[model samples]
Target: QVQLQQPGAELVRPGSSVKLSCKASGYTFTSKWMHWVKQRPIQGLEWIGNIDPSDSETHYNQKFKDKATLTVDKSSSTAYMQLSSLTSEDSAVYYCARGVTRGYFDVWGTGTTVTVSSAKTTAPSVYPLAPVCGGTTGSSVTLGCLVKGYFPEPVTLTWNSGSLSSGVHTFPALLQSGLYTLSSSVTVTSNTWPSQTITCNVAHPASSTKVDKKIEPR
Candidate 1:
């Protein structure tokens, strides 16, 4: 099994820089192109560049030509990307992939998060939205929560005191005004909805706070 192992997350000061790593295994590293991609919160993927480890040659997208640098270490089968002069706009998830061609990425790393923050930080404002009932299956419903206006990265969300886990979906945090906004949802069978009170629990480490908002069926 081919694997690209990446660091989970990074926190860097604004105006500074960070270098992310993707260590490859189970195949010849220098035999194929390693591509770097960027995805801002709730945004589409953008190709940063590709590097040929065999010759140390690189090609970058025009948009990222000045912002990203790609390099490889064949001795250890690892690829690295250095992002320079970061800002809030650059706060996003960066991924390393094994590219068979320009646009086709067959295997991908789990992705690393690059969060740009300043000297000050803020707590997230969390809101548990009313549950939306109904699905194509007609037996399931969804419970959603909104997390907004937070600074720095990394927040945690839990449903019903962590009683439910299988149907949870949390979206990546979207950056704006130096703050971040995120959302999460959980699904449950209709039979369980009427008698249960669902809760969205948020943990924001930056501000050292925890909040719980909940909903119940009418």
Candidate 2:
């Protein structure tokens, strides 16, 4: 059995870098490559890169080129990655796993949350595009909302249809330079859709104001 120990959460300003440590146990150190994965709130997962402890060889995703640096310490049985030029999009949870090739990390860390703060232009921009109606008109209809170009992690999304309370389905946010984009999908029936106009509301901590976009059956 193998386990990875990581440090606690981090809160730092933009333009600053963070060094995260992943100590390994219950395995042969240097026998495998230590890889890092990133998740931004409900945003999806990304493979940053990996480092071999014995030879110090590393490979990174083209998406993370120059943005993340991978390293290791043979003596400490630890793997590390330094994320540089921090931005709101860089605020996310990072984890380390053991793997050989470019995919399928069997084991994962508990995840270290990194937050980027005290920077201008950190607020999220909510864009609720037209929903794709999937089901028949009399029975049901599905609505999908795409929120794009938000900064900082952890944005709140809600769906409102008069007094009807329904849950929102969210996808992992992706990083571009230093901003994030996310999408959510939901389905409702004519019984619930006829009451009022449906809306998607998004809120973030960086801004005092919240954003909204409306969607209804087509």
Candidate 3:
């Protein structure tokens, strides 16, 4: 089986640079291209660049042209990416994938997490938005919660006091003013939604704060 083994997590101070590696096996490495993608917590994938190991040729997305450098080693069948001028915005999971074409990737590495930290930290503010009624089916509804202004990117959200296990969608956290903001929502049967009390619980480790916001349907 083909595999791409990635190294462990990375913790680095802001303004520093870090290089990550992905070792490929069970395939002809020099014949194909290797690509790198970035994904923040609960976010979609962003393609950074790709490199041809055989010729050392590289292509990068315009946004990451100055932020990322892609390289490869034909002998060892390994791919590498160097990220420069790191900041809190650079804190995310980077994946190395085997490229089939510019926009297509076949096999993917597990993932490598890079955390860029500074000297200061901030707490998260959580608020439960009004419930969205699904009148089309009249069988289900959605409850949403907003979390913002948090530093260090280690926050957790629970639904209905951890009673819910599925039907939840949490959006990617967006950075603003050196802080992060995100939202999560859960869907439930309309009958249960009106009769039961639903809550959104947030946990922020930076300030050791836990917030529980409840919603009631009229």
Candidate 4:
């Protein structure tokens, strides 16, 4: 059992380095490795690297050979990833997910949206309702996250458990109200439940707001 908490968003100037931190809980911090993943606005997901908090050993993807560095603080039970020489292209969503058995990532931190910009950006606020989790253990369980009253489109939705069926999208027939609201969910396979909990993260890039809804053990 592991839970990760990350910063909401970061606004950094170009050519600067931003160090992201992930505070881990629910397990021995250094018992396993942690990984960093990158998701750019329409570019998709990329695994940057992973670090062992115990020994400081790391492995990085060749693509990010000199661009990314992973480190950990055993005393604080926190992990860090530094992205240097950033540009607008680095303005993307980053996540720190725990490395499960055999190098698989089953649990993840909410997410941090990093924007490499020179202009001042306004961050929005998101009010998230508790997740609606239903269904039996050992059965396909469905969970829903409702975020009400927000601005801007392209609200990002993420779940730390279960399989994400598709991309982060607005609920069909969303209101045309002045403010923005979005809803989304994921259904986990039967056997995957009861052992792990789920968390829904609703984030607005411009607003740098992340609403996390955790679905406790059912």
lDDT of 3 by residue, 56-141 (tens): 67898999968897777667768889998798889889998987656689999999988887645788888768744534256777
Please provide, for model 4 over 1-218, each residue's C-alpha lDDT reduced to its tens digit, 9 standing for 90 to 100. 57999988887889889999999999888777798899876678988888876566788899897888777887887898888889877878999898853367868999998867665444444443332455455556656677666544457666763355453344742433445456665656657655666677666767767666665643
lDDT of each model, Cα atoms only?
0.82, 0.76, 0.82, 0.72
Angstrom error at residue 165, model 4: 27
Pairs that clash in candidate 3: none
Using all chains and alpha carbons, the TM-scores for the candidates as numbered come to 0.65, 0.54, 0.55, 0.56
Q: What is the Å distance of residue 136 in model 3 from its true position?
A: 41
Pick by TM-score: which candidate is best? Answer: 1
Off by over 4 Å in 4: 121-218
RMSD of each: 5.8, 8.0, 6.5, 13.3
Pick by TM-score: 1 or 3, better one: 1
RMSD after Cα superposition, model 1: 5.8
Q: Sorted by lDDT, highest first, which candidate order results?
A: 3, 1, 2, 4
